[PDB]
Design a protein around this ligand. Sequence first.
Ligand SMILES: Oc1nc(/C=C/c2ccc(Cl)cc2Cl)cc(C(F)(F)F)n1
Ligand code: NA
Ligand SMILES: [Zn+2]
Ligand SMILES: [Zn+2]
Lengths: 298, 109
Amino acid sequence: SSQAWQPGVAMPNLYKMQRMLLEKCDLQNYGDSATLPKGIMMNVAKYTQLCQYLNTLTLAVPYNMRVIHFGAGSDKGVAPGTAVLRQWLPTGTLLVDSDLNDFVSDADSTLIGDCATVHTANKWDLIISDMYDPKTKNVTKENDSKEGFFTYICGFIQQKLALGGSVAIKITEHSWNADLYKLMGHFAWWTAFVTNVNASSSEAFLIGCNYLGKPREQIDGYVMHANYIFWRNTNPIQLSSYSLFDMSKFPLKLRGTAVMSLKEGQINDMILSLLSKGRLIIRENNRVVISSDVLVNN
Amino acid sequence: AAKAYKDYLASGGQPITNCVKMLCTHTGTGQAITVTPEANMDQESFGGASCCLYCRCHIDHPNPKGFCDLKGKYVQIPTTCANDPVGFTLKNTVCTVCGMWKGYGCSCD
Ligand SMILES: Oc1nc(/C=C/c2ccc(Cl)cc2Cl)cc(C(F)(F)F)n1
Ligand code: NA
Ligand SMILES: [Zn+2]
Ligand SMILES: [Zn+2]
């Protein structure tokens, strides 16, 4: 298994082209555990492998890039994922994180509360989500599209993600949403990525690379999630932390990607070409302001 | 605050855990506090905020302005003291010339 030296495994294109029915996820390696470097947390290992994978894609990387991270709080009250993102991202990158409960973070700004209580008029270049509700998993009922925080993620992408931007959203067998898969078709490229350290889990990151703001391809989310599970059920992934031992090429290379403010009437086919190659970001560059709502009562 | 922790260690004092240890090459400059992990062969790098007593306890920082020199940065700790990063950062201090830990890398003499 040559995949063991990779940071993880991306869903092969042929699996994306099937029309499968949703089945239970039954992983062969379920229960196994990867051997992490001494004293390293699973959350640190997982995010390190996600970033090592993102390095191989055509992410747009402007000056003073804007990154937002959802579901960043751990049970212990810290933000391991945020620490890895800050290590990975160019120095000076604006990094904002968020979660439902309080936690200590290395982010430039931390937002506590749900989506309905936070607001910004600013656009972002990269969205990372580790949001996940453990009570979502229920094997005694049908596995339908989830319509909670995922509806907010979809709304955030379609309104606050800059053209040329990218996303990495955590999903699982039971934590998923049909509209989010459909929205993957609005990017120049997409995949479902499984980290090698957590390959015994149904977890994956839906990765949308270079947002076009329009459907490049029509994707049925119900079918694509079924395709994802079929892939996982028929392709055992060997648990591996091998990639964690070589961090020499870890930092995201600065590309100094151009940021331009254009209108929908100016987005021609040559602009789409630049967006698709991660050579352009379309958004304004105003001061970044985030609002936090407070319900007041006596 | 910082005084109580020193004495808390006595009588089987439990050291603050869950400090976020980072993956790195361990071929860094070895400086105390940096914008990215800079641990050498004898150090571990941790996310700054998770090693700051003031951040962890959700209390004000000693500077009148309220600035934290750990949050958003990485702190290098000797591998021998990696079991207690918060404690090590309190006790020791950084050299304002070379930016190394005093008695743990600093040799401006
Ligand atoms: O407009 C706006 N929405 C949000 C957050 C939405 C949200 C979606 C999914 C999940 Cl999982 C969590 C959240 Cl919080 C955030 C912001 C701001 F942070 F940029 F101000 N501004
Ligand atoms: Na960095
Ligand atoms: Zn602090
Ligand atoms: Zn010195």
